[PDB]
Design a protein around this ligand. Structure first.
Ligand SMILES: CC(=O)N[C@@H]1[C@@H](O)[C@H](O[C@@H]2O[C@H](CO)[C@@H](O[C@@H]3O[C@H](CO)[C@@H](O)[C@H](O)[C@H]3NC(C)=O)[C@H](O)[C@H]2NC(C)=O)[C@@H](CO)O[C@H]1O
Length: 489
């Protein structure tokens, strides 16, 4: 009984460092200045390093080390310890640890490709990477295994005292492991369609199925302040993105006021910034530029509570929409899931007007205008309408699905950044300034992050081998294994 309580104490570091709560300067580097901006969700008002940074594709490797260091320092060590102490003795403990582990580590595989996963811990001299496919094969094995163990112990209440997501209810942990597996299956759907359909159907036809109610969403019901509260409100260092303004305002989406605040730069209107701005000529340094852009829309308080969002029920309905579009057994009806996806997102924020919104076929994303620097203006790239069109092509149908999922995933930039790179949707604005020297394409946009400095330093051979598992050079232009060019079908 004492062994249990000792192990149970290792879960909170895992909960708090998937999407890192503290210190917010470390969250800023883990995610905010890569995925949160690359997704088209947010934009830093300040052109850090005189405008030569991640957002203009001149990558700051000291920042990007933290995408790797946070999960490997705080999550993978705890998971390995839990596995070693409980896999035989307390399988339910191992099971929930594996689920949290795949949660943290598929993000990493979705940034770097090859990651250290099945071989983590094996030596202090070297560390051997899995290829991304192998990492994904391990993800599916791990969820199925942990889904089986929890089903065998579904009524045990012994996790209650350590559960920041579900208060010890293994029913929810199974429905979330199913939903997570469905997400990864959707991700490998273009590159490995038989495996994707197989894995997708395993979760769609499980007796307990996937998340479908808002309380069953996966959240960390934390105590610490939301990391983005410091960045948004204390630092003024992140604001609404122009792509969010194009799509949310054009649709007259009521979530815009759940997600953002009316701006100061244009009173009573929501205003985003183009990501990828250089240090412009009108400004003598980055602080004078930030001064004119800090006045755009803040993120709103409702999305920056201590409760951190990892998987909405809305998302799962859109994963079901694409599953059905692709013909996976047990996915249900494509239109019905799409409409319910939007419904579940409104309900999440207690918003009315759903019937009018899902029937609207005249509203489109608006052109983006920058009142400070009108050279930044750009016609809306996304032209899709809301109401389901059963006669649209498979690309347009997928676009409608992925575009509403993107609204619904906010503010979790990482999942939306992966989905954008996988599908090309929604059509977020490209960068204004591409300082990659051609290593990254402006219209295709950034594809990945190169293996991190700490690994180059202390794991050189492991990195050299990991590069042979990439489908291109070790830089930000190389498509990840699930990122396949051409159609989505
Ligand atoms: C992109 C950018 O410039 N962001 C600004 C932040 O950098 C800044 O927060 C400060 O960040 C530095 C790191 O960048 C923090 O220093 C770190 O302190 C830790 C704690 O011991 C230490 O291990 C590190 O050596 C040291 N540097 C690094 C790279 O790890 C510093 O404590 C942060 N200060 C605060 C209040 O969080 C914020 C705040 O002004 O502004 C951002 O815009």
């Amino acid at each position: 009984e004492v062994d249990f309580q000792n192990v149970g104490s290792l879960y909170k570091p895992m909960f708090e460092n998937i999407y890192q709560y503290t210190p917010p300067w470390s969250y800023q580097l883990q995610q905010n200045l890569n995925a949160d901006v690359f997704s088209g969700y947010m934009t830093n008002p300040r052109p850090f390093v005189a405008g030569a940074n991640n957002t203009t594709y001149n990558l700051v490797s000291g920042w990007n080390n933290f995408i790797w260091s946070v999960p490997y320092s705080n999550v993978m060590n705890n998971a390995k310890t839990i596995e070693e102490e409980t896999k035989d003795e307390f399988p339910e403990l191992f099971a929930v640890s594996q689920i949290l582990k795949v949660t943290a580590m598929h993000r990493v595989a979705d940034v770097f490709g090859p990651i250290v996963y099945t071989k983590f811990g094996e030596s202090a001299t070297t560390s051997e990477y899995d290829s991304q496919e192998e990492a994904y094969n391990a993800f599916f094995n791990d969820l199925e295994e942990a889904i089986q163990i929890l089903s065998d112990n579904i009524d045990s209440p012994r996790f209650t005292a350590f559960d920041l997501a579900y208060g010890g209810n293994y029913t929810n942990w199974i429905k979330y492991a199913n939903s997570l597996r469905l997400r990864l299956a959707i991700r490998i759907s273009k590159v490995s369609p038989a495996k994707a359909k197989s894995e997708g159907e395993k979760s769609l036809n499980h007796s307990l199925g996937v998340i479908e109610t808002n309380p069953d969403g996966f959240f960390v019901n934390g105590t610490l302040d939301h990391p983005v509260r410091t960045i948004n409100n204390s630092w003024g260092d992140i604001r609404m993105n122009a792509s969010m303004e194009s799509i949310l305002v054009g649709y007259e989406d009521p979530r815009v006021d759940s997600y953002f605040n009316a701006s100061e730069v244009v009173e009573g209107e929501f205003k985003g910034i183009r990501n990828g701005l250089p240090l412009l000529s009108e400004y003598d340094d980055e602080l004078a530029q930030k001064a004119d852009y800090i006045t755009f829309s803040l993120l709103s308080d409702e999305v920056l509570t201590p409760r951190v969002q990892l998987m909405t029920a809305a998302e799962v309905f859109f994963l079901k929409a694409e599953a059905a579009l692709r013909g996976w057994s047990g996915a249900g009806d494509t239109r019905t899931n799409y409409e319910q996806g939007i419904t579940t997102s409104f309900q999440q924020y207690g918003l009315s007007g759903i019937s009018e919104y899902i029937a609207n076929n005249t509203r489109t994303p608006i052109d983006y205008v920058d009142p400070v620097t009108p050279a930044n203006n750009i016609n809306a790239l996304s032209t899709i309408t809301i109401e389901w069109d059963e006669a649209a092509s498979n690309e347009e149908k997928l676009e409608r699905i992925i575009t509403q999922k993107w609204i619904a995933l906010f503010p979790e930039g990482q999942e939306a950044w992966s989905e954008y790179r996988r599908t090309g949707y929604p059509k977020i604005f490209p960068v204004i300034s591409n300082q990659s020297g051609g290593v990254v394409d402006t219209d295709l946009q950034i594809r990945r992050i190169p293996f991190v400095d700490s690994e180059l330093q202390t794991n050189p051979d492991g990195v050299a081998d990991a590069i042979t598992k990439l489908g291109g050079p070790d830089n930000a232009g190389t498509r990840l294994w699930w990122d396949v060019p051409g159609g989505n079908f």
